[PDB]
Amino acid sequence: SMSVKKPKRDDSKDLALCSMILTEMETHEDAWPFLLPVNLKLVPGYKKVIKKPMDFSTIREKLSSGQYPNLETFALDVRLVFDNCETFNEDDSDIGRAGHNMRKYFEKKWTDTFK
């Protein structure tokens, strides 16, 4: 509350560390469904169904331009990528499986880096 603060967690390396995580997601072999925005002219249903599209390139641009206020808003966009993928793709598809695998990979890196 006013003039009463919990001790200051060092957040000065968060930007660099989110960048490193994102590089590791970018270079994973199962990243291919997620590297670029879904082409809304060429994929029927996507525009109407997926209210907030997200992809790695879009996260990389937001990161590089100071559009994440803190590391939690960065994790929310990453998870949005996987949540979208589960919304649109059967679990038993190449892309459905890619999404589960990438989410697992992300969540481990997140915990090991920050928890």
Side-chain angles (χ1 to χ4, degrees), residues 1-7 9-12 14-114:
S1 80
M2 199 186 327
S3 310
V4 179
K5 286 308 161 333
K6 295 204 182 52
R9 183 206 167 252
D10 185 6
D11 67 342
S12 63
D14 288 357
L15 188 59
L17 288 163
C18 290
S19 181
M20 288 170 55
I21 294 173
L22 180 56
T23 296
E24 293 165 0
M25 280 197 308
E26 292 164 336
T27 58
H28 194 298
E29 65 163 288
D30 303 337
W32 58 268
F34 315 114
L35 291 178
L36 301 176
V38 173
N39 181 336
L40 297 183
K41 303 166 198 296
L42 303 189
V43 176
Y46 209 83
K47 191 167 202 300
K48 186 64 184 275
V49 171
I50 301 292
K51 301 306 178 172
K52 291 173 68 170
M54 185 58 52
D55 67 286
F56 297 168
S57 79
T58 300
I59 300 170
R60 167 69 74 193
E61 187 58 41
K62 286 182 65 168
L63 194 59
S64 292
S65 58
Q67 291 184 67
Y68 292 114
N70 55 57
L71 87 174
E72 303 304 335
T73 57
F74 168 78
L76 283 172
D77 268 357
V78 178
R79 291 167 180 149
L80 173 63
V81 172
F82 309 127
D83 297 348
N84 290 347
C85 183
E86 279 196 52
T87 291
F88 209 81
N89 294 263
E90 280 292 342
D91 295 343
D92 186 17
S93 57
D94 297 271
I95 289 169
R97 275 191 284 284
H100 291 291
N101 285 355
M102 293 303 308
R103 179 195 301 274
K104 187 85 173 173
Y105 189 75
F106 168 66
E107 287 308 345
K108 170 96 155 62
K109 307 276 183 184
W110 190 251
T111 295
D112 295 354
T113 302
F114 292 117

